[PDB]
Amino acid sequence: FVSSRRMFEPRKPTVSDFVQIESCVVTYVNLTRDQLPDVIPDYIDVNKTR
Amino acid sequence: FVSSRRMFEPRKPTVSDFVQIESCVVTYVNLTRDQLPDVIPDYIDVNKTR
Numbered sequence: 001f002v003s004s005r006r007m008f009e010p011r012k013p014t015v016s017d018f019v020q021i022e023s024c025v026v027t028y029v030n031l032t033r034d035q036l037p038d039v040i041p042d043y044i045d046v047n048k049t050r
Numbered sequence: 051f052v053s054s055r056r057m058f059e060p061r062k063p064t065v066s067d068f069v070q071i072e073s074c075v076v077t078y079v080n081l082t083r084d085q086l087p088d089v090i091p092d093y094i095d096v097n098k099t100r
């Protein structure tokens with residue numbers, strides 16, 4: 001869930017809401033190809049659509 | 051078109067500028083999926099593409 005830090009406004013995540021980062025860190029939740037759409041309903045699997 | 055709240059700089063909107071919302075309200079514009087490409091040139095109908 002994503003919410004304003006000031007105001008609790010829980011919300012589902014968005015693909016555009018995120019940015020890629022060069023390096024992972026130990027605090028990043030582990031995730032897989034299949035899991036990412038589960039976390040992000042907005043995900044687009046180009047490999048599968050192709 | 052989307053433009054600054056402060057001033058007038060209109061341009062076509064992008065799905066990247068939008069977000070899901072839990073609750074619809076009667077103020078919201080009724081819309082159809084085929085209108086999404088019409089409303090947003092940046093929308094993609096994933097199901098039909100599949």
Ligand SMILES: *[C@@H]1O[C@H](CO[C@@H]2O[C@@H](C)[C@@H](O)[C@@H](O)[C@@H]2O)[C@@H](O[C@@H]2O[C@H](CO)[C@@H](O)[C@H](O)[C@H]2NC(C)=O)[C@H](O)[C@H]1NC(C)=O
Pocket residue numbers: 025026027028029030
């Ligand atoms: C998320 O992943 C990082 C990266 O570690 C790898 O992936 C993990 C799922 C696990 O298989 C690690 O053994 C892999 O090395 C995790 O960071 C690891 O943390 C453990 C804790 O002791 C450490 O032994 C590993 O060396 C770390 N991995 C590194 C440094 O590459 C992390 O714990 C995973 N989970 C979360 C919630 O971030």
Ligand SMILES: *[C@@H]1O[C@H](CO)[C@@H](O[C@@H]2O[C@H](CO)[C@@H](O)[C@H](O)[C@H]2NC(C)=O)[C@H](O)[C@H]1NC(C)=O
Pocket residue numbers: 075076077078079080
């Ligand atoms: C969009 O669709 C909704 C759902 O039908 C419309 O909401 C209705 O509005 C009328 C107007 O008084 C109410 O009587 C109904 O109770 C509403 N139904 C709901 C909220 O489920 C809405 O008018 C349509 N148009 C717009 C611009 O939202």
